[PDB]
Recover the amino acids of this structure.
């Protein structure tokens, strides 16, 4: 028998995988490096991730073509094989863990909206941890090495040698950040409901004690119903402070005994709650719109790596499956995840108007 020639596949991948991977990540790095409106702390995640996926298209992907164009005889120097295999597992694991770090980070931005500055250092710490985790996962490859009389080596991980690494490594590289991003998913669904619920609670506590005052025919109705709003009240240090002093300024009229004067102070306070509720109504509308975008984009990413890591584990556990027909799948399924990681940064940043504006400027060679 005979297999034939598979050059048209390598041409197809360059046009639709390697070129989009190299081009998309380079656009993302330029947007953070050039445009200063994007030089925030959370975008250093996007830059760190864009550099990892860029290194895939430059070093990992071109060598991976040689398995498709050429034969099963490693055509490059020997040490290059475990180095390429090390870089392959390293950068492919970094991309999945960056998204887990982003999923966790963005959940913290919702649940604990307060922390800010300190944020520049916290990212570099989280970036480092993500890269160190990817090193410890990819380090078994250059340590064990590829087995050899014939100096010709076959550069691929085998089931006999890396059977435990193909399994436990898959557990730590994909299914562990998968399980985390699933947990942070429901944490974010719950965090946004309570954030919107707490709002409905305060909105009525104000609007109920307000109608009490406009219908008040005495001062005691104003005294007690205003204290209910006193304990129920950077920019946040001043947000409540505006109305905490107004309730005090209005109770000052209530301690005087002025009924019509105090009621007029409350009816003119309603133009102050609509200034803070409308602002925080949006903060929660936008906090919910960005979560649904990150949810779908991160899901399609993780979904396009499911074929490889399920087959990568099945090739270890299933003793009755056809090894020839299963490694033929890994040869293909890897390129699906290569696409997933290659364009994941670009897709996620296409939903940012500032990023999308920067891209449209750079594709026509502007650079401001
Ligand atoms: C045949 C293979 C190996 C080579 C593929 C060519 C690649 C490297 C070329 C083809 C198109 C190129 C991109 C075309 C557009 C831009 C916009 C520019 O503002 C930044 C560089 C960037 C993003 C280029 C980066 C390099 C690029 C992706
Ligand atoms: C030529 O095409 C191919 C190119 C590269 C590879 C290796 C693969 N690269 C994606 C990441 C990853 C791989 N292996 C792991 C084993 C364990 C862990 C944790 C991760 C990984 C294969 Cl398997 C190819 O198919 C034959
Ligand atoms: C496997 C499918 C089973 C359950 C998936 C449930 C949804 C899992 C999708 C999670 C996507 C994600 O990463 O969410 C992070 C969150 O948005 C940060 O704010």
């Amino acid at each position: 028998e005979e297999q034939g020639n598979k050059l048209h596949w390598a041409a197809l991948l360059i046009l639709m995988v390697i070129i989009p991977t190299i081009g998309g990540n380079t656009l993302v790095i330029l947007a953070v490096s050039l445009e200063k409106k994007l030089q925030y702390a959370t975008n250093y995640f996007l830059m760190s991730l864009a550099v990892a996926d860029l290194l895939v298209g430059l070093f990992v992907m071109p060598i991976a073509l040689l398995t498709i164009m050429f034969e099963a005889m490693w055509p490059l120097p020997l040490v290059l094989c475990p180095a390429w295999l090390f870089l392959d597992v390293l950068f492919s694991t970094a991309s999945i863990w960056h998204l887990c770090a982003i999923s966790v980070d963005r959940y913290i931005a919702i649940k604990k909206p307060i922390q800010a500055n300190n944020s520049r250092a916290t990212a570099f710490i989280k970036i480092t941890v993500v890269w160190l985790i990817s090193i410890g996962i990819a380090i078994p490859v250059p340590i064990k090495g590829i087995e050899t009389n014939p100096n010709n080596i076959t550069c691929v991980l085998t089931k006999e040698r890396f059977g435990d690494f193909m399994l436990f490594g898959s557990l730590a590289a994909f299914f562990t950040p998968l399980a985390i991003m699933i947990v942070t998913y429901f944490l974010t669904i719950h965090a946004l409901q309570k954030k919107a619920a707490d709002l409905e609670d305060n909105w009525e506590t104000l609007n109920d004690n307000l109608k009490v005052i406009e219908k008040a025919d005495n001062a005691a109705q104003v005294k007690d119903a205003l204290t209910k709003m006193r304990a129920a009240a950077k920019d946040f240090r001043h947000g409540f402070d505006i109305l905490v002093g107004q309730i005090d300024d209005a109770l000052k009229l209530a301690n005087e005994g002025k009924v019509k004067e105090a009621q007029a102070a409350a009816e003119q306070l309603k133009t102050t709650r609509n200034a803070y509720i409308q602002k925080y109504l949006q903060t929660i509308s936008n906090e919910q719109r960005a979560s649904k975008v990150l949810g779908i984009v991160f899901f399609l990413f993780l979904l396009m790596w499911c074929p490889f890591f399920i087959t990568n584990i099945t090739l270890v556990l299933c003793d009755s499956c056809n090894q020839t027909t299963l490694q033929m799948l890994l040869e293909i399924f890897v390129w699906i995840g290569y696409v997933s990681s290659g364009v994941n940064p670009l897709v996620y940043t296409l939903f940012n108007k500032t990023f999308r504006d920067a891209f449209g400027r750079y594709i026509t060679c502007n650079y401001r």
